[PDB]
Scaffold this active site. Structure first.
Site, mmCIF file in Angstrom:
data_model
loop_
_atom_site.group_PDB
_atom_site.id
_atom_site.type_symbol
_atom_site.label_atom_id
_atom_site.label_comp_id
_atom_site.label_asym_id
_atom_site.label_seq_id
_atom_site.Cartn_x
_atom_site.Cartn_y
_atom_site.Cartn_z
ATOM 1 N N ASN A 191 0.851 -1.190 0.009
ATOM 2 C CA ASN A 191 0.149 0.588 0.076
ATOM 3 C C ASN A 191 0.903 1.095 0.424
ATOM 4 O OD1 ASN A 191 -2.337 1.653 2.122
ATOM 5 N ND2 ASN A 191 -2.837 1.099 -0.254
ATOM 6 N N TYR A 225 -8.001 13.143 -1.039
ATOM 7 C CA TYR A 225 -7.541 12.392 0.158
ATOM 8 C C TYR A 225 -7.201 13.029 1.392
ATOM 9 C CZ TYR A 225 -4.378 9.282 3.395
ATOM 10 O OH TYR A 225 -4.424 8.022 4.263
ATOM 11 N N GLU A 234 -10.022 9.601 8.177
ATOM 12 C CA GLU A 234 -9.553 9.609 6.841
ATOM 13 C C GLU A 234 -10.708 9.822 5.726
ATOM 14 O OE1 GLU A 234 -8.021 5.768 6.058
ATOM 15 O OE2 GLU A 234 -6.220 6.880 4.467
ATOM 16 N N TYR A 236 -12.623 10.245 1.750
ATOM 17 C CA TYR A 236 -11.596 10.682 0.604
ATOM 18 C C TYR A 236 -12.645 10.987 -0.754
ATOM 19 C CZ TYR A 236 -8.771 6.736 1.596
ATOM 20 O OH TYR A 236 -7.109 5.690 2.052
ATOM 21 N N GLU A 328 -3.344 6.243 -4.603
ATOM 22 C CA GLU A 328 -3.226 6.063 -3.491
ATOM 23 C C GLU A 328 -3.424 4.088 -4.333
ATOM 24 O OE1 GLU A 328 -6.130 5.291 -0.181
ATOM 25 O OE2 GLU A 328 -5.125 3.311 0.080
#
Ligand SMILES: [Ca+2]
Ligand SMILES: [Ca+2]
EC number: 3.2.1.8
Lengths: 393, 394
Positions: A191, A225, A234, A236, A328
């Protein structure tokens, strides 16, 4: 002799100037695209040029004047005859440099004594006198024409944050590029998250980007992001992706910037976060119902998402941390090239728009310019192009 | 020996500086919290200190330097050993004085030649030489570390309005205190409204306050209070009350700053207002669903209320009058003590934040400082504490 000059009514600063054009071919003339301001406008003479010397259209000349001092000529061989077809020329003007491009390829960088005064965008075609060593002498051949398909100016974003995180799996070659640009080339990774943006995000920011390259080969996300703290969340806003579309628990939808997004929530435990690599937090998502086209300018009006989230009971933290336009990925390979920008001035040049452009008329530049500007020599063709003419009588 | 110093990247001025910390204990060392500006920041040497001399951690030393002149040392007995637990130490730095506190108790006051140049917030641990009569001799004990759980700086409120209105029933002993602070002690009154705030209110203000004392004995309100004209409206954001919870015609609820409030509208007739002793006007209310804790910091994000009131068709006037953090009372007795604050710099010290702090590294202050600063000696624990270590050798 009669010639032609088209010029903007507004002035423009630092940023990227692009033009699609086809210059005229003939000894003794010049076809150009340039920025200009000078003493007649109350400023120092600051100008940035793209010039095609009709004596040899297999070359392009780059130049610039600062406070009236030129002498920065760079001639480059094109690899084609510019007069035989439309090509895209451009210069990125910033305080410490100017970079010029041909069909998207970098061909020359300048750093000495760079201009700083905002000027008008201009395009002209003219025959010279007293500069035979530079242009060849003009032989009177006419009419001659220079054509321009479109003009585009994009101003700077002022991004102050660079994000380059990998979990260590596979290879992630991220490139912190000039201004708001970045690129990523990745190979068989774990990742990662790479992007440019802001140190302190905001629920009111409007993010404008262009993904010149979006070529994930597997699981990759092209996504706004960021994070908040208090609490740790978090978020998105995914515009495009690769072989996997991110989902979670469905909340509803939100229409924004011409797209419709599905809103989701997902919970995470024991995974890397900004408050430490083993924590517990929620993720908030807006995921586009189908991938957004890439390659052109796209906007994300982040406040419409923050508001639609508020509406479905999803509220963000009050300590805002970073906010980026990211790439990402996970278990994949790919390339991406993304530029975050400020504002775009777009001119398709399909006809004469008198609020944003003016046709020089009724006077000559004198000096080496052996012709008078005429609005009658500035016309638009049917296929929507600016056609600049050099004529006689 | 290697030592440690952590300092803010920004500079800070007049206001209250607080820290929760537990200094190292040992003869020969000092653990501190202090503001600093000097030659290396391009200024005169202005500094205010809180110093724990490791030889005796049952005492704390206060001092300050103004244009390079010190000499204001004051040592006080803590009544406890500072090295055994975390305590809160503070100094309120104002143009005309400095007040130092230990666990919120006033311990010392100075007024002469008060520093005026904004400085950095700093924390350090170091061992000295050549000052044995002041610090004791440093015996090399190691490793040692001073811990800091959090730092907070709160700037001044810049409230420019004092409210002290009584209808004349009973006694209302209002105190216009320093900065944004006030107090009221009242007995068997009619109606009264006391508070501090601003001459011109704003739909965008965010109020930070703390009710140090909230002890109504009967009907009393702890509330954001203000008016508009065009039209004439009296509005409230009530956080706590005594025996009576104010209500009216129910509209809906709003969630803000951790609490849920009920939204109400009411009308007052032939009553006093900023426009006359007998007038008719509308009242807008947000009333918390249960009482808000007092004694700890509280925030009222007023635009949350203005925006929800607008949702319900309750629009405020266009000519804004005063807006204060008030104690209001009716037919009651009681005491209150409230402080309106300015903006806050909050640092919980959960990790290194290179945007607001830096680690001193690779040099010694020299002189009395017998050690070299090392960024490697500034660390963060798992549980969110800054640990500044003093270590031997290489
Ligand atoms: Ca066109
Ligand atoms: Ca802490």
């Amino acid at each position: 002799f009669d010639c032609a000059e088209y010029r903007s009514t507004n002035i423009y600063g630092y940023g990227l100037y692009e033009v699609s054009m086809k210059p005229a071919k003939n000894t003794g003339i010049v076809s150009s695209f340039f920025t200009y301001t000078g003493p007649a406008h109350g400023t120092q003479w600051d100008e940035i040029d793209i010039e095609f010397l009709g004596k040899d259209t297999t070359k392009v000349q780059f130049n610039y004047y600062t406070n009236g001092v030129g002498g920065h000529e760079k001639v480059i061989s094109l690899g084609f005859d510019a007069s035989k077809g439309f090509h895209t020329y451009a210069f990125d003007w910033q305080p410490g440099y100017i970079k010029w491009y041909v069909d998207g390829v970098l061909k020359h960088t300048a750093t000495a004594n760079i201009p700083s005064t905002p000027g008008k965008i201009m395009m002209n075609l003219w025959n010279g006198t007293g500069v035979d060593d530079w242009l060849g002498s003009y032989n009177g051949a006419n009419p001659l024409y220079a054509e321009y398909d479109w003009v585009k100016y994009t101003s700077n974003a002022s991004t102050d944050y660079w994000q380059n995180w990998t979990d260590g799996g596979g290879i992630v070659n991220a490139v912190n590029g000039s201004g708001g640009n970045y690129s990523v080339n990745w190979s068989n990774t774990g990742n990662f998250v790479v992007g440019k943006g802001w140190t302190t995000g905001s629920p009111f920011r409007t993010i404008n980007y262009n993904a010149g390259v979006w070529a994930p080969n597997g699981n990759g996300y092209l996504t706004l992001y960021g994070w908040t703290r208090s609490p740790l969340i978090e978020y998105y806003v995914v515009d495009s992706w690769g072989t996997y579309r991110p989902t979670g628990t469905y909340k509803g939808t939100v229409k924004s910037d011409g797209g419709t997004y599905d809103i989701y929530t997902t919970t995470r435990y024991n995974a890397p976060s900004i408050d430490g690599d083993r924590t517990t937090f929620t993720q908030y998502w807006s995921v586009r119902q189908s991938k957004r086209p890439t390659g052109s300018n796209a906007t994300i009006t982040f406040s419409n998402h923050v508001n639609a989230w508020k509406s479905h009971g999803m509220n963000l933290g009050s300590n805002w941390a970073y906010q980026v336009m990211a790439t990402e990925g996970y278990q994949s390979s790919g390339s991406s090239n993304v530029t975050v920008w400020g504002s775009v001035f777009w001119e398709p040049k399909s006809y004469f728009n008198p609020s944003t452009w003016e046709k020089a008329d009724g006077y000559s530049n004198g000096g080496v310019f052996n012709c008078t500007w005429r609005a009658n020599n500035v016309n638009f063709t049917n296929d929507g192009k600016l056609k600049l003419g050099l004529t006689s009588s």
